[PDB]
Amino acid sequence: GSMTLIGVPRESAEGERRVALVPKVVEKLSARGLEVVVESAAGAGALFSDADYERAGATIGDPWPADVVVKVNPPTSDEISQLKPGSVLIGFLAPRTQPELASRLRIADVTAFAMESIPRISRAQTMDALSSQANVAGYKAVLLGASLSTRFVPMLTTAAGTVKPASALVLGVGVAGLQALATAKRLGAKTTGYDVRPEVAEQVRSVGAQWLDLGSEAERAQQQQALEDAITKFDIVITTALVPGRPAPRLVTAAAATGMQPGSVVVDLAGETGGNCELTEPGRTIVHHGVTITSPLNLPATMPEHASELYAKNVTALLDLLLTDDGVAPDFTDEIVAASCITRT
Amino acid sequence: GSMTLIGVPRESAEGERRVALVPKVVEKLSARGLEVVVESAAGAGALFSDADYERAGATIGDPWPADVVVKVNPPTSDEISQLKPGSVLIGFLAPRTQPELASRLRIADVTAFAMESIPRISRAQTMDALSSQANVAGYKAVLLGASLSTRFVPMLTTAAGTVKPASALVLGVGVAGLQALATAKRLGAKTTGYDVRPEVAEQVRSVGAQWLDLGSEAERAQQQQALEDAITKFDIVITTALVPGRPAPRLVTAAAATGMQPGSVVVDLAGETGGNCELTEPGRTIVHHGVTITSPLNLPATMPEHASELYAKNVTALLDLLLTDDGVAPDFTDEIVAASCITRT
Ligand SMILES: [Ca+2]
Ligand SMILES: [Ca+2]
Ligand SMILES: [Ca+2]
Ligand SMILES: [Ca+2]
Ligand SMILES: [Ca+2]
Ligand SMILES: [Ca+2]
Ligand code: NA
Ligand code: NA
């Protein structure tokens, strides 16, 4: 590993607090003989110091000309300009929403792997960055809902009075939605999950939530109306549904939100692509007819040490495929390597 | 009840969102024949509307000249100027920290009852406003700690990696501290409670927390040092200890806080009286050597519907003592009435 240098930059995006490698993971790479260069204050968002990285065997310095640069968010034009020809870049590279990025990296002679493009196969389970970040997001979505609510989540019997538990509904039960159900349940909520994919029922039940069953043309309208009616009954509604490269599916109409009791909260995780809720204002928290509608845009950044640690393990699992005793040598017959590389033509 | 008018003002204090009666409680008073006047937008902080109050039988109007005015925070000079002679005022009246208030109310010919001065006796269990508000505060303290942490609270085993649970320590286990222990446990933390009163051990254990045992002159120093060392081991530390009318007890030294791991959080509930933590900046969240120190000043206001509902039940339980078929007639031979009245000389 001594001839291979891995570079970790500070994330430049507004509000970002994650860093692509954390000191514990850097320590493992150093122990294997790889050289790691970490940009000064790269870990500052996650409350790490430069000394933490140096203790893990890194040097503090310019990360951009490394043989392999590992980062979180897509690189800016100015960042790409600093990559050296023949290098590898690993990170979220927005293959759907930033298609020019692939072109730019190819022109720069950088071989680049998009973490979003890691295929959903058994061998890649440890490399699934979309899932690790979504786990953090689902957990923090519940904390945000509970923090904005005007009411307790758990049932409590106090000397002053008794209160019923909150009912929480999660719409879209992928990784974030499942973690939201689990976290809401921990906190004492009565929980219900809904997803257009029927096979998700088992997962919803496995975390102790009720599976919402609604009951083609005039039937589809009865269904939409049944979903709208169901939403009005909940104190906390968390929406998570995405379509890669497309607007977020509309799941919470204006009427549904308006029909919720005062002090209820809708936590819409889909704000970057338009929101699942018609009344969502991306990146803001607003009140509509006494109902709080909030649209966090980067929940992983709000819990940045564990978001970064999990992400770092995802990135290093992929990197381990790319490394041989000879240094950096991606095997393009490996499905994971071929599927995630955005620069190969 | 038809000849007795109860007035509910909008709280004027910066950041306050509670209201002394909520619509559900107003409904009960109306049903008994009492007239209730609620100031317009009094419930707006808790997301209630004027229509909610009118539906509960209230009229919307000037609350100050009522026979009984019920409010949350101590009245300002201008508010006192609007009370009518011969009226009753019930609320938090800061008997320790605002002694002139009693004098001012006496001069105004108002008979005033401080909720802080409700005696801690069996008959007054339903009237304990300090406790109901502290329950809300302990719960919201944990949500705030978990929201500021850079790490998960629960142990999780994910495809990306496993994380250990957070350890939470609560210093001062009265009502807020006990609810903080219970809430942290719900969320998945390993919990420990500490209090200078030994009899609190049973309460700490009853919520599934470990009781911290530390081990006169040089012994007291060994104890302080043992507490300091213990604090460094925790991911979330919640401090709640108060002395009525005096500075908050110092429980977390600068060294203790500094010795905590990066991304750990200290949630100090005692900021209004100086803070339990030496590094606390009242009403702010700061970072010191990678450790987050936060000092919320009004956690009840952050969950205002249930804080107000419980408070409303406390206030109305006292009010029921003061009411007879004849209207307002406090019996000063009743220990609760005599102990809580601050204007009687
Ligand atoms: Ca080299
Ligand atoms: Ca090194
Ligand atoms: Ca390898
Ligand atoms: Ca009258
Ligand atoms: Ca009336
Ligand atoms: Ca009575
Ligand atoms: Na409901
Ligand atoms: Na620890």
Automatic annotation (TrEMBL), chains A, B:
Signal peptide start and end residues: none
Residues binding Ca(2+) 2, per UniProt: G57
GO cellular component, one term: plasma membrane
GO BP terms in the entry: NADPH regeneration
Class of enzymatic activity (EC top level): translocase
Residue ranges of domain Alanine dehydrogenase/pyridine nucleotide transhydrogenase N-terminal in the record: 7-137
UniProt-listed CDD domains: Rubrum_tdh (cd05304)
InterPro entries registered for this protein in UniProt: AlaDH/PNT_N, AlaDH/PNT_NAD(H)-bd, NAD(P)-bd_dom_sf
Molecular function in Gene Ontology: metal ion binding; NADP binding; proton-translocating NAD(P)+ transhydrogenase activity
One Pfam family this sequence matches: AlaDh_PNT_N
Enzyme Commission no: 7.1.1.1
Binding site for Ca(2+) 1: M3, D67
Binding-site positions, Ca(2+) 3: D320, L323
Keywords: Calcium, Metal-binding, NAD, NADP, Nucleotide-binding, Translocase
Reactions catalysed, as given in the entry: NAD(+) + NADPH + H(+)(in) = NADH + NADP(+) + H(+)(out)
Free-text function comment from the UniProt entry: The transhydrogenation between NADH and NADP is coupled to respiration and ATP hydrolysis and functions as a proton pump across the membrane.
Name under which the protein is recorded: NAD(P) transhydrogenase subunit alpha part 1
Organism, as annotated: Mycolicibacterium smegmatis (strain ATCC 700084 / mc(2)155) (Mycobacterium smegmatis)
